Design a binder for this molecule. Structure first.
Ligand code: CL
Lengths: 327, 328
């Protein structure tokens, strides 16, 4: 592998060790991971690799950092003249009548962004804007700059220009003040705070992908329903972060045979975190009465207004009865 | 009245709309005829400083007196190879239809020189497909290695991107035009002397242009006989496909059916040549010549090119009232 791959593997090893074992993010954790995932490139090449998050913390420890990771040390205003564009559908090609665009300041952490969700409804456009930002920012001034970038990048700027700051929902994140953090279930728990900071789960290679799936199930299998009832909300939310990332990796059949949803203690997770999970293929509902359900516009059941039907594994005698149509 | 750009927008809308019934060479008389019903309010002095591209610029230039017709390739620009544009649809934490895709390109390049990396979760991790959209004669490998470093630096150096070798990349080389005049027909440019087309943004997002587009399409197909359709070049059929698909994305399933384009002889001959599966605003329909109108349905007892479908039916309340509300 390369230095990039090695850095990835060390980061995967920490994420993976956090599934069963909370650990303080400090140099000896990286030292202990290095036993299984050594770093064999030279420190000089490491300096050319520009990273953030735990990747960058690992990089710094390999370069000699001895201090523990401090919550909020990555805070960046960003470049207020460089912008990232995220889009979900377009005006030319909406997704089920919707298109969403998020423009953000490049390299801001927490990210400062204006998201505008839009929809064609008789006989105009309905817009919803959310400014996700940080306490103390100049919210009206950030909205206007970002709105201007929305007008310049939009294939339909007429619908944007009428959105006023009074219509915007604001969400403010706070920067940490250097608290040390515990890594557990791919999430940072800053000492003294009650919230968590979910971390990205890599595990893009064969071994780490399979071990991620197996450790999640092992984590849940080793909790009784009463254990789960005793978990604080912050730990429930971190578990939710790993659970949802794992289900995104499965199609419907693989998610079902994975069988996490069959564990008695996972049913307690479902009651506390929700029953609705996105897979690679679609949306499933792990229902306690009806079993596995699959989102289905033509379904004859509704779970919290989502129409669903019973999910069914493909069976060769049934597939053989499907009428294959002439083209 | 509307600003100088909203004016251009409406004039461009008007050209696209005029291209539905007949092909139109892109030349000043086309613009002038559009100005009869969509007149340009603002002063030409404002218009001098607006930054536009594509057809909206050619409209601008014609407003400023240009007598020459539009020339294919006249917009070529190698772009700024020190400055980069960054967009993405989907992320590893919220994939869109199972994928996430990132595109990084050279600022102001036309054709756009870009590296797109699309990824999905598969067994054993992540699969990637990379596409370098570029121009004949570029240094493809150097562009790739430059844009790949950007991707790594933009994505927090995921191991899956670093694994992508130049030999894994699909290279799509666009041709630059050579000054050919161009015909606009069904929202697509046909450069004379070339066999390819360039689909254009269709626009028409206001209420009146939406309805006009829908009306003009049905009329354009009505104006054709089945024999007419069987004589059209593949170029013209692809342009028609462009407009048909944009229109069905504007309907829910019920409105798509009462729109009734699918019921026309000449459209059935179109279906035979472009396919029967059309995404709508609501789901997906199959306009079948034997079974009738079908609708995507994972429970379907029929499959059309592997899509499971059922027969379409109007929403009724005695099916609705029986929907079982589930315990939370
Ligand atoms: Cl058939």
């Amino acid at each position: 592998p390369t230095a990039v791959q090695e850095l990835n593997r060390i980061c995967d090893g920490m994420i993976l060790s956090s599934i069963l074992r909370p650990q303080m993010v400090e140099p000896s954790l990286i030292g202990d991971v290095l036993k299984t995932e050594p770093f064999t490139s030279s420190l000089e090449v490491l300096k050319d690799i520009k990273v953030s998050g735990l990747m960058r913390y690992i990089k710094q420890v390999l370069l000699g950092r001895k201090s523990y990771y401090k919550f909020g040390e990555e805070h960046a205003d960003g470049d207020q003249n460089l912008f990232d564009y995220q889009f979900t559908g377009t005006p030319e090609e909406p997704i089920k009548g919707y298109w969403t665009t998020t423009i953000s300041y490049r390299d801001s952490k927490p990210k400062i962004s204006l998201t505008i969700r839009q929809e064609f409804v008789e006989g105009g456009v309905e817009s919803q804007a959310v400014l996700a930002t940080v306490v103390g920012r100049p919210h009206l001034q950030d909205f206007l700059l970002l709105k201007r970038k929305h007008l310049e990048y939009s294939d339909y700027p007429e619908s944007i220009d009428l959105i006023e700051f009074g219509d915007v929902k604001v969400i403010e994140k706070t920067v940490g003040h250097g608290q040390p953090v515990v890594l557990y279930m791919a999430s940072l728990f800053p000492i003294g705070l009650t919230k968590i900071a979910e971390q990205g789960i890599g595990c893009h290679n064969e071994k780490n992908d399979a071990t991620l799936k197996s450790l999640l199930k092992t984590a849940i299998l080793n909790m009784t329903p009463d254990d789960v009832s005793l978990l604080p909300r912050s730990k429930l939310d971190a578990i939710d972060h790993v659970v949802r990332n794992v289900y995104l990796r499965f199609n419907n059949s693989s998610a079902v045979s994975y069988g996490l949803h069959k564990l008695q203690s996972f049913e307690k997770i479902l009651q506390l975190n929700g029953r609705i999970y996105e897979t690679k293929e679609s949306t499933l509902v792990f229902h306690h009465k009806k079993g596995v359900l699959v989102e289905d516009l033509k379904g004859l059941m509704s779970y919290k207004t989502l129409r669903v039907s019973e999910w069914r594994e493909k069976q060769e005698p049934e597939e053989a009865r499907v009428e294959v149509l002439e083209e």
